Amino acid sequence: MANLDRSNDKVYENVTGLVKAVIEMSSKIQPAPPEEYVPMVKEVGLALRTLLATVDESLPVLPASTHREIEMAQKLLNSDLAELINKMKLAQQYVMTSLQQEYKKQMLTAAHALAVDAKNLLDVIDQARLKMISQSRPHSNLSELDRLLLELNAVQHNPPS
């Protein structure tokens, strides 16, 4: 081991990667074939599951002060998992019939809150990191993700003409 700047970057990294997929899939969600749906869920499922561990190590990596939301985020994360995979699992069966675009719209909505949530996790605790530094005993961009999230919203409302 060397420094304690390994886990701090790990979580801040995963929180971004997962977002990249959330939007990507939302783009080709329509044309999303039945062969890409199987693995698709596996991708999102990994993000949420990973987030649980990422935050776990974030506790110590950050100064005790923002554990409130972090704690509630743990149990909450689990629920979001079963909830997400649940609805998504339905679309996989309600796609061969005809009502695909329907479940697709709502589907994106769910993943939308998840993507932003996973990111907000580190964003929130971030305020604590500076709280200690800018006071005493000191120790993939924000805007980039913001703009990306915006498009995701519009993509859900409806396709490009």
From Swiss-Prot:
<comment type="function">
    <text>Non-receptor protein-tyrosine kinase that plays an essential role in regulating cell migration, adhesion, spreading, reorganization of the actin cytoskeleton, formation and disassembly of focal adhesions and cell protrusions, cell cycle progression, cell proliferation and apoptosis. Required for early embryonic development, embryonic angiogenesis, normal cardiomyocyte migration and proliferation, and normal heart development. Regulates axon growth and neuronal cell migration, axon branching and synapse formation; required for normal development of the nervous system.</text>
</comment>
<comment type="similarity">
    <text>Belongs to the protein kinase superfamily. Tyr protein kinase family. FAK subfamily.</text>
</comment>
<protein>
    <recommendedName>
        <fullName>Focal adhesion kinase 1</fullName>
    </recommendedName>
</protein>
<feature type="modified residue" description="Phosphotyrosine">
    <location>
        <position position="12"/>
    </location>
</feature>
<comment type="subunit">
    <text>Interacts with ARHGAP26, GRB7, DCC, PIK3R1, PXN and SRC. Interacts with the ARP2/3 complex.</text>
</comment>
